Amino acid sequence: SDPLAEVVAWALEHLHEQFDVETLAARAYMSRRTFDRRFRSLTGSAPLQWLITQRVLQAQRLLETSDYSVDEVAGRCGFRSPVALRGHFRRQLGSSPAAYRAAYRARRPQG
DNA sequence: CTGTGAACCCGCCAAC
DNA sequence: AGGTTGGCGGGTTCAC
């Protein structure tokens, strides 16, 4: 029975919502400073970095599986604006959302 | 790009 | 003499 773990699982399932890190902290019955420390010490990353990281990976999935527009995806991935999506996506994957989907559909027409 | 304002987040450290 | 906690300061990142 692990509340730090339970909140991580909860985050994944509920990536599409937008929440304070302070929120996650509360949902894990910890002070911020504890949450922050214990999170990183478990996760390898800090909360909103990990959030971003995860949200991006969901974008990557939707860009592969679905036909939602880049702008429709940012919403489904919890990004507050389509401009933030491009930003974090480009930074950790190496190309824009569209350009990534474009290369994929070409290289792997079949899925 | 540029700019303002808020959020994060990690070292430091006294305090259990 | 081992360890976890949590406010606080404020550079860096995020967001618009």
TrEMBL record:
Full-sequence range covered: 230 to 340 of 405
Molecular function (Gene Ontology), one example: sequence-specific DNA binding
Record keywords: Transcription, Transcription regulation
Name of the protein described by the UniProt record: AdpA
Domain of life: Bacteria
Organism: Streptomyces griseus
